Amino acid sequence: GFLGAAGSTMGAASMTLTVQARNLLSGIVQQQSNLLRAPECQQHLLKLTVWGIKQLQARVLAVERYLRDQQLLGIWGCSGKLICCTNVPWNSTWSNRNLSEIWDNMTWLQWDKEISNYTQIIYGLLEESQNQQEKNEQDLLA
């Protein structure tokens, strides 16, 4: 389903990342498909100027969020993948925990809370590593 086994542990959750990944845009396109189930009423809905504007805003925001996240993955060199290995080491201060409890017993919901104070730090670190890697690639190619 849409969330799938949200309460499963992290290792199991990783099996359906694709299902979740595609839902933001397929849902939007389907919403248009749902409007088209009765094209004759659209003219009665467009009279409601405020409802019209709110729906446009909702779609625009969903697109903007999607793109921002995809760009961010591209910035870090993770574009095109659901799972991205990187060159940034994990800090024990973020979480002093083994790759046993983290993947087999904890869920993503629990994990998200545990390390919620480091998101902006990790992201900045990923950006710097990628910036260096690209320049190094150009010199090696040359």
Binding site: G1, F2, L3, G4, A5, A6, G7, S8, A13, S14, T16, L17, Q20, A21, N23, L24, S26, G27, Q31, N34, L35, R37, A38, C41, L45, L48, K54, Q55, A58, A62, R65, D69, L72, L73, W76, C78, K81, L82, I83, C84, C85, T86, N87, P89, W90, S92, S95, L99, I102, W103, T107, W108, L109, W111, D112, I115, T119, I122, L125, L126
Partner: protein
């Protein structure tokens, strides 16, 4: 030997505000707006292992339902004829023809000078009015009650404001979660949470003291309130069984169409056929007795196991406050509920008044006129919950008193929306791994 792995498609979420989409199923006001049907098979996901925290009193889905219903309501009034031209001195006398005692002085016969379709011509017409909407100037001359405050717009005669269960659907990127807890407290951690595409179908029923045509608390009578020790907070009482209430408007009415301008029509109440009798509601006495006994048994959990509990009648204020405001067939009934709350724990007939000029959603400056309904009205409704308020109590630690409360329309939606929450899905996150590029 720990590396950062970035993942996309992680099943986590946050509490969030987003506008929900309204959907329906297979000239009604909500049928016109909520055009898109829901998925015929909106199968839920049981989020096994997941415990979520809820707060029904801060649920923003309620605020949206409030905003949306008012907006749609106003846009369904906006396009029709204004009744401004009728704010003239009325020449009124009593209707004394076939009147029972209960209706003496309530039904009035008023004549007035209104325009015709030509600007040079007037017509003298007459119609019937209910006492509640007519105010005496300084004994024959009367004014409509809203002439000193607001404009009155006639409701469109074809539009049916009949509640349709409607469903609210999440926008992509968001999800609706609902908790299947038979004993849900109203706040805090709740188990058996499932994820759905849309909410169940909730009818936009308008009422005050008694909540009609909703859910029935699974298996038990449930008392829920925000800050229960504070007598100023409304208590929503949900019943485990429905109580059927039968309401009527016994008079056989006629209507007349008066042209008031070019393509403009005014709907006036015509003569009444047969005897003039008072509108009323019938509640089974035994069912009602049993129901309150169950409610008290539960109320005592917060007030004391040997505490004496009294049900008193309503306080002062507007009819929307002091009576049960009942909307049926399109006419507005204001029913005396004191006969329902006149007992102490240790068939009932409620007389009703009819009003045509109303001020919904606790607002002033605008008013709706409800065209009359011809024939008679017979209503059948289900009482599914009650709204109570508690007395301050002074220094009384022996007994306690409750009165019918409510009147705040948001309370009529919390009663159905309490189990739902909307969250934002957040697909990105990281975790340590055993790989490096």
């Amino acid at each position: 030997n720990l590396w950062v792995t970035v993942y996309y498609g992680v099943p986590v979420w946050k509490d969030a505000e987003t506008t929900l989409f309204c959907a329906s199923d297979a000239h009604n006001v909500w049928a016109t707006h909520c055009c898109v049907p829901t998925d015929p098979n909106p199968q839920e996901i049981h989020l096994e292992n997941v415990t979520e925290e809820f707060n029904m009193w801060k649920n923003n889905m309620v605020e949206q339902m409030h905003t949306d219903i008012i907006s749609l309501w106003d846009q369904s009034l906006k396009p029709c004829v204004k009744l401004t031209p009728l704010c003239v001195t009325l020449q009124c006398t009593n209707v004394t023809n076939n009147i029972t005692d209960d209706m003496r002085g309530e039904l009035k016969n008023c004549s007035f000078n209104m325009t015709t379709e030509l600007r040079d011509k007037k017509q003298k017409v007459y119609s019937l009015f209910y006492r509640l909407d007519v105010v005496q100037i300084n004994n024959k001359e009367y004014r409509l009650i809203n002439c000193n405050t607001s404009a009155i717009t006639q409701a469109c005669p074809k539009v049916s404001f009949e509640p349709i269960p409607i469903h609210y659907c999440a926008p992509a990127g968001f999800a609706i979660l609902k908790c299947k807890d038979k004993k849900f407290n109203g706040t805090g951690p709740c188990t058996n949470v499932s994820t759905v595409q849309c909410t169940h179908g909730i009818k936009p029923v308008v009422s005050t003291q008694l909540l009609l045509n909703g859910s029935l608390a699974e298996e038990e009578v449930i008392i829920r309130s925000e800050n229960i020790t504070n007598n100023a907070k409304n208590i929503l009482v949900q019943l485990n069984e429905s109580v059927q209430i039968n309401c009527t408007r016994p008079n056989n009415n006629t209507r007349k169409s008066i042209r008031i301008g070019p393509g403009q029509w005014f709907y006036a109440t015509g003569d009444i056929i047969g005897d003039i009798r008072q509108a009323h509601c019938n509640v089974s006495k035994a069912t009602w007795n049993e129901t309150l006994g169950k409610v008290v048994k539960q109320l005592r959990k917060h007030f004391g196991n040997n505490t004496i509990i009294r049900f008193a009648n309503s306080s002062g204020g507007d009819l929307e406050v002091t009576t049960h405001s009942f909307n049926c067939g399109g006419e507005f009934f204001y029913c005396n509920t004191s006969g329902l709350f006149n007992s102490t724990w240790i068939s009932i007939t409620l007389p009703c008044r009819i009003k045509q000029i109303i001020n919904m959603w606790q607002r002033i400056g605008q008013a709706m006129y409800a065209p009359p309904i011809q024939g008679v009205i017979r209503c059948v409704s289900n009482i599914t919950g009650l709204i109570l308020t508690r007395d301050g109590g002074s220094t009384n630690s022996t007994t306690e008193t409750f009165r019918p409360g409510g009147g705040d329309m948001r309370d009529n939606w919390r009663s159905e929306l309490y189990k739902y929450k909307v969250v934002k899905i957040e697909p990105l996150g990281v975790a340590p791994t055993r790989c490096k590029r």
